[PDB]
Design a protein around this ligand. Structure first.
Ligand code: HEM
Ligand code: HEM
Ligand SMILES: [Mg+2]
Lengths: 353, 353
């Protein structure tokens, strides 16, 4: 069988898998493929936050301004738009951009139209919240998994194509093994999520730095092309269990090591909902993510519910991408967001250390 | 933290764990310890089988004869007695003995009073079924896990003591990592479960040989010391899930790679029930046992229910022992047993391979 790890990323092992090499997965799954040109990507989650209805026009315009900047030289190779309401009752529009290299994203961010917009006094006077959560995993530091082969969302869209059926899935610990770095590295978390400028409690501009091997999961659901009975199966049987799990991570984050949990629905440029959704989850460690997925009743309920109704599925599209990052390859910037936004909730404040 | 692997069995690794060094389990568990003298143990399951009520006195007396043989030189260091009814309606009394070394068990088994009884033509004429399922893992080939510290049942009873709190538990795959041989070996199954003498379809004396890395789990429950409120919790909430899982494995064995599944209840010498039970499960591979425990809805139901009710438990005792063996260290012998008994069911006959 094909391996989840790209040919060019395969190397002499020092760390080994948890299954013997006779292992054969019980069902087909696929991963994104890319050659050695794709060395390190940039995932940039750009947000607009508001709570009052009268702020919606301004927020939607801000989102449109951000998307317009994505067309400029060195804009991202791919992007999508989402909406969610957080546990403080704030609406959040997030545009996620994927760049195929670090220098392009840097040239983009430092260009006049983009840099003057982000540094503008308008950002403090708009009354909206703004954030940028920008992470740059190397090709060895992310893994994908798709229950389909065509039209890959997320990071898959900036990769070169699709694999054949892969071996490293269908057992807990398989996510870890799909990370090419797992051949060598434990991806052990160390350090603190830290405020380096400002104060969350006062608002204004706040900058947060990450620590070694923060993990980010984007796990998605696409039911747009499903027919009547299958859509009914996702909506009636699968989603309530998924919602319960998302609610748990959103409201019990510190207890399990989840810095931020967002359950988001795709939108068009006008804010209308599309039949695609995903979790955006930031974790204190890959291993804390492993433990929750494999042993918390919430994901296990999702897991067993899936296999119970799996026979009636065919058009539903389920996938995830998971990334870990060097300490230095992350920045989380906030402007006028509430103190529980993203990395602001759990970051250690400047006095605190 | 202490390791589940005895100090004298720790060696340079070719195979690694699935958790980083920082891993700390969320609840305490302990393992049996034995010093460098213990090199290989013997687990001898000696059974008496019958279905007619008029056979019960002879069956219980045969069980007493077996227990009496344990008082002879080189008898086992520990034993216990159990009862179950199999899916063919036969009652099975099983006396399990544990020996601290292979040679002592061999000396006992070949001694005149023991060998003459097993080889007697009276075993054919008794009308009862008899069986000996005797397996001998090296110290590097078995692991134990106890959710308690005192009065170890099973193989723990013949070990030297109890460990402190251990690191290698609380995640799927931890069982494998508690096997000292996992440091260097995949414990990959190979070969066939083979009839080597006799014919299961004709009855009489049948002899079955195991293959490399068959796995045997004894997973036990002891509620004898629990008070009323906890007794009800186990019997009403936990036991039904366990029963469901055991029935599944008993009746769908070939589908999941479980050669033989028994859910047995401890009894005293007179056949009266005790409030201790355990699974005796023989598996085609350790990894099939891994797959079932971690991903089959039956054990996941057991596992999720346990953590749901865990707060109401304190005196309930849960544990397991899991072993793998070379082909040569397994002997499965049957006298007038029905053809679904233990390893008779799935064994390949002389010309089938
Ligand atoms: C309806 C939605 C979901 C379904 C049906 C589902 C189902 C599953 C399945 C079947 C697997 C095993 C995949 C394989 O290896 O073949 C899996 C793995 C995993 N899922 Fe989910 N999941 C869902 C949503 C989520 C979400 C929102 C998260 C975010 C925390 C999540 C986290 C994980 C992780 C971390 C793994 C990897 C476990 C490992 O390989 O060690 N899942 N999921
Ligand atoms: C009411 C009875 C049972 C309960 C409450 C239960 C619960 C659990 C728990 C909590 C664990 C995790 C232990 C740890 O690592 O800390 C576990 C592991 C395991 N259980 Fe069960 N269990 C029960 C019965 C059984 C039975 C009868 C079997 C027979 C196949 C079984 C097979 C396994 C295996 C093979 C593992 C190891 C998983 C691994 O580390 O990869 N369990 N069980
Ligand atoms: Mg590193």
């Amino acid at each position: 069988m094909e391996s989840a790890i790209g040919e060019h990323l395969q190397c002499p092992r020092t760390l080994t898998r948890r299954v013997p090499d006779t292992y054969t997965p019980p069902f087909p799954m696929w991963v994104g493929r890319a050659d050695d040109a794709l060395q390190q990507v940039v995932m940039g989650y750009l947000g607009v936050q508001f709570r009052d209805e009268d702020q919606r026009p301004a927020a939607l315009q801000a989102m449109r301004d951000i998307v317009a900047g994505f067309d400029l030289p060195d804009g991202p190779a791919h992007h999508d738009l989402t909406h969610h309401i957080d546990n403080q009752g704030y609406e959040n529009l997030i545009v996620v951009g994927y760049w195929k290299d670090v220098s392009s994203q840097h040239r983009w961010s430092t260009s006049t139209p983009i840099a003057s917009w982000w540094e503008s006094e308008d950002r403090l006077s708009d009354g909206l919240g703004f954030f940028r959560e920008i992470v740059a995993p190397r090709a060895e530091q992310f893994e994908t998994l798709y229950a389909f082969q065509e039209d890959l969302p997320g990071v898959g869209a900036v990769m070169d194509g699709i694999s054949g059926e892969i071996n490293e899935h269908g057992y807990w610990g398989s996510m870890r093994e799909r990370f090419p770095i797992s051949q060598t590295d434990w991806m052990q978390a160390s350090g603190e999520l830290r405020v380096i400028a400002g104060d969350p409690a006062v608002g204004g501009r706040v900058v947060v730095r990450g620590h070694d091997n923060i993990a980010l999961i984007r796990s998605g659901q696409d039911w747009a092309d499903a027919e009547a009975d299958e859509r009914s199966l996702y909506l009636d049987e699968i989603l309530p269990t998924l919602q319960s799990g998302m609610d748990f991570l959103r409201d019990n984050g510190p207890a399990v090591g989840c810095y931020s949990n967002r359950f988001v629905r795709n939108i068009d440029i006008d804010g209308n909902f599309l039949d695609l959704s995903y979790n955006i989850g930031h974790w204190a460690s890959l291993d804390q993510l492993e433990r929750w997925s494999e042993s918390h009743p919430t994901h296990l309920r999702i897991f067993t519910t899936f296999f119970r109704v799996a026979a009636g599925l065919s058009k539903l599209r389920l996938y995830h991408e998971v990334s870990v990052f060097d300490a230095a390859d992350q920045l989380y910037e906030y402007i006028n967001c509430h103190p529980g936004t993203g990395m602001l909730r759990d970051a250690v404040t400047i006095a605190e250390h």
